[PDB]
Write a protein that binds this DNA or RNA. Structure first.
Ligand SMILES: [Mg+2]
Ligand SMILES: [Zn+2]
Ligand SMILES: [Zn+2]
Ligand SMILES: [Zn+2]
Lengths: 57, 67, 45, 263, 49, 113, 84
RNA sequence: GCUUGUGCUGUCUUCGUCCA
């Protein structure tokens, strides 16, 4: 619904099959942990990584 | 299906008390009194025997597939 | 070469990839393959 | 300085009182007895035939949870620490169960007493499934009708409850201190009066209730701890307590050895 | 946020453990008078793709 | 599918040391100890033993994440004493306490049986 | 014609966030494709961190061409734009 | 003397999941 529904995070590799979030970012995503699912997109270039880390973080 | 070996919450062995429980219920004891006689004090263990449904008796009524 | 089992009378027999799929003795149309001979192991957990 | 007082004693449960020890020491002892005392339990199941109505992994899980005698398990070795090929007599115990229903009517029950020890360590008291009496049948494993047979070969190995709860020697450890709440470690929820809305502890008569004119003592610490250790039969209660103490000592000695070797 | 904590020892003792079954189906189709599919073990020599 | 092996909670890898000590230069005479394949059972025992020593001015521990079996301890002592010596004294003292506790328990069990 | 003389440049003298992101990305890509570095790197290895270090010291050899709506443009050097 | 093979349908319908 708004531009805070897509934000750039930093990866931490962890066991088990879920994505893990700090609980303070659940408000802009309007998400809870009763079955929700979220998508993840990997940048493929240096320029695109810089754009994500300097604009959408 | 069949009585669990251990209590889920604490792990007390409850799998050796099913037949004695049925015997005590046959003799006319109340369920609480029967559980008291079997020395199941914590209600976590009492839940395991009080709420078990024996489904294996229904599964055994179908004819065996190999002889 | 391969063992089977009848779905009705639980009779064991064999097929050679040329017979009709039927029970020999009771003529049921439903048969099941027999369990393998490879070793089967579980971790008891 | 530490003192031990035993209230009730049995093969499968002991009720004791610990005094002049820290709360952390008592809690660590409880945790060690719950999760770190080694026992013996079935870990590998080879199924040669199973025509019952129960799935293979169902029966394997049930077999894993059967308590075996673990008195001499300290002399056994861990399977990953044994240099042997496959499993040997110094790191495993082999049990075998063979059950069948004879006749065309009725049902046969498969109990844990039908497990037969085939091999294991020489002269060590390990491997046999636990039984309350000589006439006790044990834990119900499966049920068989006509033409249904169960034929398995199990391997019992040494482990701890950190890896899987089947290796836990204890079921539940009651633990409690300060029955009269003199240390004010808890704040009692109430509707009208906290005193008459909360049941008295079972050790409330072991300590003197506080005087009405007494003022709060801020210098006091928890000093007396009441605990009951219940075992599954794989070990006796005193054995569990002693081996918990020994396990804690070994962990501390390993820390000390690492410290001295660090130089 | 509606998460829950479960006991791992309870899970080890069989709490909420379950069995899962899935079935697959296949059959031999008839395309012509003599063109029939066959159930057999394929071989890289005689079989393509 | 992504579940780690249960023996990883207590089995130490060959390349992973059991104990790593680094100084904390912010305050004098402080070290940071990293314990591998350990949990609250040893941490709380060591912390509350060390907290009663007169020459120990700071002691704390934290388990960063429950999915990883490790904890980190911070220890600060007086000028005269070194923190490692205090840790060794704490380990020896708890071992002695457990030894006399086991002795008294065996004595009482033999008495009551 | 379309170029605007350096004396009459009327756009902002500060580096915007979009220009900063694009310049960092382009410089990081060039560094990762073996372009000479103009600052002394102590132990840095990541191209983006080296690009950020170059930006902080005003050593990025790139020019930003800002386009006006009518079609004209102004050329600004990365070393003469103020960066926060 | 003997060498390891290299990919996938379409179109509807229904039942569901998380928001709204
Ligand atoms: Mg939701
Ligand atoms: Zn229980
Ligand atoms: Zn037949
Ligand atoms: Zn061996």
């Amino acid at each position: 619904l708004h531009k805070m529904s897509m934000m750039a995070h930093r990866v931490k590799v962890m066991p088990y099959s879920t994505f893990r979030l700090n609980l303070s970012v659940t408000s802009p995503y309007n998400a809870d942990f009763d079955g929700d699912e979220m998508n993840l997109h990997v940048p493929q270039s240096e320029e695109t990584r810089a754009e994500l880390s300097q604009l959408c973080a | 299906m069949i009585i669990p070996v251990r209590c889920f919450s604490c792990g007390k062995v409850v799998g050796d008390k099913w037949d004695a429980y049925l015997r005590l219920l046959e003799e006319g004891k109340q369920e609480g009194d029967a559980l008291d006689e079997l020395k199941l004090k914590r209600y976590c263990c009492r839940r395991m025997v009080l709420t078990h449904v024996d489904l294996i008796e229904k599964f055994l009524r179908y004819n065996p597939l190999e002889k | 070469g391969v063992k089977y089992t009848c779905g009705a009378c639980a009779h064991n027999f064999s097929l050679n990839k040329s017979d009709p799929v039927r029970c020999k003795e009771c003529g049921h149309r439903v048969i099941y393959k027999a369990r393998t001979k490879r070793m089967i192991q579980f971790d008891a957990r | 300085e530490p003192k031990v007082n035993i209230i009730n004693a049995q093969d499968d449960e002991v009720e004791l009182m610990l005094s002049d020890v820290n709360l952390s020491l008592a809690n660590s002892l409880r945790r060690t007895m719950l999760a770190e005392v080694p026992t013996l339990a079935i870990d590998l199941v080879e199924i040669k035939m199973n025509t019952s109505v129960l799935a293979d992994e169902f029966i394997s899980h049930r077999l894993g949870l059967i308590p075996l005698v673990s008195e001499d398990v300290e002399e056994m070795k861990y399977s990953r620490d044994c240099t042997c090929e496959d499993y040997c007599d110094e790191c495993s115990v082999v049990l075998e169960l063979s059950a069948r229903h004879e006749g065309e009517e009725g049902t046969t029950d498969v109990y844990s007493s039908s497990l037969i020890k085939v091999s294991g360590p020489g002269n060590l008291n390990v491997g046999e499934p636990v039984r309350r009496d000589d006439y006790d049948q044990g834990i119900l494993l499966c049920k068989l009708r006509n033409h249904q047979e169960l034929n398995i070969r199990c391997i019992a190995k040494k482990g701890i409850a950190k890896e899987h709860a089947k290796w836990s020697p204890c079921s539940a450890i009651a633990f409690e201190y300060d029955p009269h709440n003199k240390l004010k470690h808890t704040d009692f929820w109430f509707e009208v009066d906290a005193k008459k809305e909360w049941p008295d502890s079972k050790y409330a008569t072991w300590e003197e209730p506080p005087k009405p004119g007494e003022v709060f003592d801020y210098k006091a610490k928890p000093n007396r701890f009441y605990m009951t250790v219940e075992t599954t039969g794989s070990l006796k209660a005193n054995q569990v307590f002693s081996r918990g103490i020994k396990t804690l000592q070994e962990k501390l000695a390993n820390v000390l050895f690492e410290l001295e070797n660090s130089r | 946020e509606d998460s829950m904590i479960m006991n791992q020892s309870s899970i080890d003792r069989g709490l909420f453990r379950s069995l899962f079954f899935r079935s697959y189906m296949d059959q031999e189709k008839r395309f012509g008078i003599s063109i029939v599919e066959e159930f057999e073990k394929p071989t890289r020599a005689t079989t393509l793709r | 599918m992504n579940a780690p092996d249960r023996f990883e909670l207590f089995i130490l890898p060959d390349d992973v040391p059991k104990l790593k000590i680094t100084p904390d230069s912010r305050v004098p005479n402080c070290i940071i100890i990293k314990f591998e394949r350990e949990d609250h059972t040893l941490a709380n025992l060591l912390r509350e033993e060390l907290a009663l020593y007169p020459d120990v001015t700071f002691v704390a521990y934290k388990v960063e994440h429950p999915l990883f079996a490790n904890f980190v301890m911070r220890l600060q002592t007086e000028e005269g004493t070194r923190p490692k010596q205090a840790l060794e004294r704490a380990c020896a003292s708890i071992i002695n306490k457990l030894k006399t506790l086991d002795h008294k328990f065996n004595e009482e069990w033999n008495i009551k049986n | 014609e379309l170029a605007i003389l350096k004396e009459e440049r009327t756009t902002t003298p500060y580096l915007t966030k979009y220009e900063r992101a694009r310049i960092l990305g382009t410089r990081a890509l060039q560094i990762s494709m073996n372009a000479p570095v103009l600052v002394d790197i102590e132990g840095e290895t990541d191209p983006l961190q080296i690009a950020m270090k170059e930006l902080s010291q005003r050593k990025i050899p790139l020019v930003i061409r800002r386009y006006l709506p009518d079609g004209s443009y102004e050329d600004w050097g990365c070393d003469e734009l103020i960066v926060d």
